[PDB]
Design a protein around this ligand. Structure first.
Ligand code: HEM
Length: 399
């Protein structure tokens, strides 16, 4: 049994093992960091089964749950939020915050998403690149999703820049254990205060809704509100950052499609679709422990054994997606849903918000900066360490 997670084959590519497993051993066992074992599922159809089977559980206190890191080990012990719940508790809590993420709600947010994007692009225009390239991540990729989720949660405008920096420290590969843990507690302390505040006087934000609708009547307590809010903040912010960066680096490698996008900005939606499939920046979230013996393909997963379903590998499953290893936004899509945001009840609560943020980014960026280009050789792009989810740390560009 090989050690999992695997390292990416190279900068922007998925681990090399997936293609091989998809071909001759779709369901196999891997060894985790503590030496324990877990089953690895690689085919699209099987990944979908793992995500919807009622015989599988996301409860981390269960025997055999696949924690991938020592941190995961300790993290599993605390009080769980909906991300780690099974029905009926799952939707009972998730339904408490889902209203803000529906298509209708997201469509109502467009003017705000657009405004936030325009504001950050304008500040880049005013700053310029006369003396050299600027960092697309720091100046755009990072703040766009950060400012948006913080605002939605309820964070006042004046505190966005500081809190955006602190949250980044949580996942900066440069950060140290001490520092990461500190920023982590700092954010929780801040959110605990925000909650008391909206408890006194609610405004139009997610925390206020939780305070009026769930805390006051006693359905959940303040600490729970703090935890749910923290989950919404950290679940996909770093992912949004990498997706925006990978999107710009990808277009830099595909001049013909980039020309299509500049010619017609309305192709942003279809560009985002191929992007979320091609670059699955969140690949280790579909994990389960079997509640009873369950068969997957030609393998029997025993009750209490762990399972990791790779949506990244699934999105490269040739049997589903023709020519899966080539970025082509003009591809003929099959009836099977790409799995960038998961599948089943747990499917990313912010899928609609995420796609709307990405779409706004790619239908605007090149309209604002038609001559926007990566300033470093694409081969020298600074991607995240190969042992982590695909992403980009910094990205010099000129315009
Ligand atoms: C393009 C960026 C994003 C990508 C690719 C992404 C992907 C995912 C994936 C693959 C899952 C696992 C789904 C499953 O269990 O089947 C997930 C879960 C989740 N995401 Fe995201 N996500 C993104 C942005 C966000 C954002 C911006 C938020 C917050 C506002 C967010 C909040 C969540 C939450 C709360 C869950 C857990 C849902 C549950 O278990 O019920 N995600 N996301």
């Amino acid at each position: 049994a090989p050690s999992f997670p695997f390292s990416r084959a190279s900068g922007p590519e998925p681990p090399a093992e997936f293609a091989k497993l998809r071909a001759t051993n779709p369901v196999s066992q891997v060894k985790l960091f503590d030496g324990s074992l877990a089953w690895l599922v690689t085919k699209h159809k099987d990944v979908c089964f793992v995500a919807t089977s009622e015989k599988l559980s996301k409860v981390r206190t269960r025997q055999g749950f696949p924690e991938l890191g020592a941190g995961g080990k300790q993290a599993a012990k605390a009080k769980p939020t909906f991300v780690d719940m099974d029905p009926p508790e799952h939707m009972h809590q998730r339904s408490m915050v889902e209203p803000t993420f529906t298509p209708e709600a997201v469509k109502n947010l467009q003017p705000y998403i657009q405004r936030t994007v325009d504001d950050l692009l304008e500040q880049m225009k005013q700053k310029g690149c006369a003396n050299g390239p600027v960092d697309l991540v720091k100046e755009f990729a990072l703040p766009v999703p950060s400012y948006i989720i913080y605002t939605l949660l309820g964070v006042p405008f004046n505190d966005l820049e500081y809190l955006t920096q602190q949250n980044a420290i949580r996942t900066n590969g440069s950060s140290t254990a001490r520092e990461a843990s500190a920023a982590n507690q700092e954010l929780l302390d801040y959110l605990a205060i925000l909650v008391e505040q909206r408890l006194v006087e609610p405004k139009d934000d997610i925390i206020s809704k939780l305070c009026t609708e769930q805390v006051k009547p006693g359905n959940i307590d303040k600490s729970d509100a703090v935890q749910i809010a923290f989950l919404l903040l950290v679940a996909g912010n770093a992912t949004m950052v990498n997706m925006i960066a990978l999107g710009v680096a990808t277009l830099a490698q595909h001049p013909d499609q980039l020309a299509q996008l500049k010619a017609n900005p309305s192709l942003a939606p279809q560009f985002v679709e191929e992007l979320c499939r091609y670059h699955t920046a969140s690949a280790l979230a579909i994990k389960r422990t079997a509640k009873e013996d369950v068969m997957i393909g030609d393998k029997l997963v025993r009750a209490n054994e762990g399972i990791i379903a790779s949506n990244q590998s699934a999105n490269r499953d040739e049997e589903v997606f023709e020519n899966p290893d080539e970025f082509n936004m003009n591809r003929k899509w099959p009836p099977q849903d790409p799995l960038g945001f998961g599948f089943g009840d747990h499917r990313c609560i912010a899928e609609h918000l995420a796609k709307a943020e990405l779409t706004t980014v790619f239908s605007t960026l090149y309209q604002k900066f038609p001559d926007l280009k990566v300033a470093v050789p694409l081969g020298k792009i600074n991607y995240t360490p190969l042992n982590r989810d695909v992403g980009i740390v910094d990205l010099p560009v000129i315009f």
